[PDB]
Write an enzyme that holds these catalytic residues in place. Structure first.
Site, PDB file in Angstrom:
ATOM      1  CG  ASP A  35      -1.826   1.199   1.309  1.00 59.11           C
ATOM      2  OD1 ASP A  35      -1.946   1.961   0.319  1.00 59.11           O
ATOM      3  OD2 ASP A  35      -2.427   1.380   2.394  1.00 59.11           O
ATOM      4  CB  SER A 199      -2.431  14.671 -13.116  1.00 57.44           C
ATOM      5  OG  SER A 199      -2.808  14.488 -14.469  1.00 57.44           O
TER       6      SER A 199
HETATM    7  O1  LIG Z   1      -7.662   1.639   1.811  1.00 58.78           O
HETATM    8  C1  LIG Z   1      -6.798   2.720   1.440  1.00 58.78           C
HETATM    9  C2  LIG Z   1      -5.399   2.152   1.158  1.00 58.78           C
HETATM   10  N1  LIG Z   1      -4.398   3.258   1.066  1.00 58.78           N
HETATM   11  C3  LIG Z   1      -4.011   3.910   2.354  1.00 58.78           C
HETATM   12  C4  LIG Z   1      -4.854   5.165   2.616  1.00 58.78           C
HETATM   13  O2  LIG Z   1      -6.216   4.982   2.256  1.00 58.78           O
HETATM   14  C5  LIG Z   1      -6.747   3.704   2.590  1.00 58.78           C
END
Ligand SMILES: O[C@@H]1CNCCOC1
Length: 330
Positions: A35, A199
């Protein structure tokens, strides 16, 4: 040093991607959700409330000869979808795709929210945003990437997500065979702890490109593309019967529709998201209404370039002293 690991969609909609990670000695292999939008490495474990575990593989520090309790440390995190988890902390050896880090903070969950419990395919998260977002208290901890950074040949990792197909996370090198054309790099702001960039604009289908600055984050942990309401309205206006539904919670469209592509700008470069990528299928089994892959960021506070956008590109996360983000076609 370098590492290279295959990442695999958890389901037929590419809702998320899991990457096998080796923790402890002997290795315990868990499938983690990488993530770039958070900075905690946390896992289901032998400490997780039993009623909140349903099929996940757990980390058991008592079985690892290299695990050590990080005494007094606790953590608690909430994500953008409202999910959450919390627990305590071990240090242990962690390896990704051959790349090994010793003394990595492995956050052991004591509690997880139902959305994590209900997802049997994800054993935890591996955060790759900047360590200033790490939630460990009272001593904030470094991400896997920040710890690995010194040993890496180059202070970079790359995300090469597949559409309905496995992809790759590489650490410490850029695979020049994994993209076509050149990589366009763009400035990153770390002020909010994210891979935040701007962007240069967008186009809908074969429409003309609109030059406009859109600040957003590159987030592998988010499924969809969340953009300003003006942009998202312009996109769905090109789809007969498409509408925003408060009952469903976003834009839906007739499953009989053919979706236009969506182009976003990276400096002078253009990344094109094929229409098929934006189709997330029936809102419920058998429904003739389908859920859109591009949604409004209005209720979020931040624009998010999630998997829908990132999977259309080879993406370089450059963690040099001056961090940048690179995009190439593939
Ligand atoms: O579920 C999402 C995953 N990315 C981290 C911040 O937001 C939450």
């Amino acid at each position: 040093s370098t590492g290279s690991a295959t990442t695999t969609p958890i389901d037929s909609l590419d809702d998320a991607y899991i990457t096998p990670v080796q923790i402890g000695t002997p290795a315990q292999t868990l499938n983690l959700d990488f993530d770039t939008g958070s900075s905690d490495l946390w896992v289901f474990s032998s400490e997780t409330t039993a009623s909140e575990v349903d099929g996940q593989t757990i980390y058991t520090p008592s079985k690892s000869t290299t695990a050590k309790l990080l005494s007094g440390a606790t953590w608690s995190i909430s994500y953008g979808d409202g999910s959450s988890s919390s627990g305590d902390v071990y240090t242990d050896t962690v390896s990704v795709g051959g790349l090994t880090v010793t003394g990595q903070a492995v956050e052991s969950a004591k509690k997880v929210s139902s959305s994590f419990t209900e997802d049997s395919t994800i054993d935890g998260l591996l955060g790759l945003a900047f360590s200033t977002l790490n939630t460990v208290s009272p001593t904030q901890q470094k991400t896997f990437f920040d710890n690995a950074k010194a040993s890496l040949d180059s202070p970079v990792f790359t995300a090469d997500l597949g559409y309905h197909a496995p992809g790759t996370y590489n650490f410490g090198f850029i695979d020049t065979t994994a993209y076509t054309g050149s990589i366009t790099y763009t400035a990153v702001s770390t002020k909010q702890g994210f891979w935040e960039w701007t962007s240069t604009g967008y186009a809908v289908g074969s429409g003309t490109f609109k030059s406009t600055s859109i600040d957003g984050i590159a987030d592998t942990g988010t499924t969809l593309l969340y953009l300003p309401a003006t942009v998202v309205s312009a996109y769905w206006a090109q789809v007969s019967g498409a509408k925003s539904s408060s009952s469903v919670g976003g834009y839906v469209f007739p499953c009989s529709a053919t979706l236009p592509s969506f182009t976003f700008g990276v400096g002078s470069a253009r990344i094109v998201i094929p229409g098929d990528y934006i189709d997330f299928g029936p809102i419920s089994t058998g429904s003739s209404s389908c859920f859109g892959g591009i949604q409004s960021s209005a209720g979020i506070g931040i624009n998010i370039f999630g998997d829908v956008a990132l999977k259309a590109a080879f993406v370089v996360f450059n963690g040099a002293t001056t961090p940048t983000l690179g995009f190439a076609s593939k």
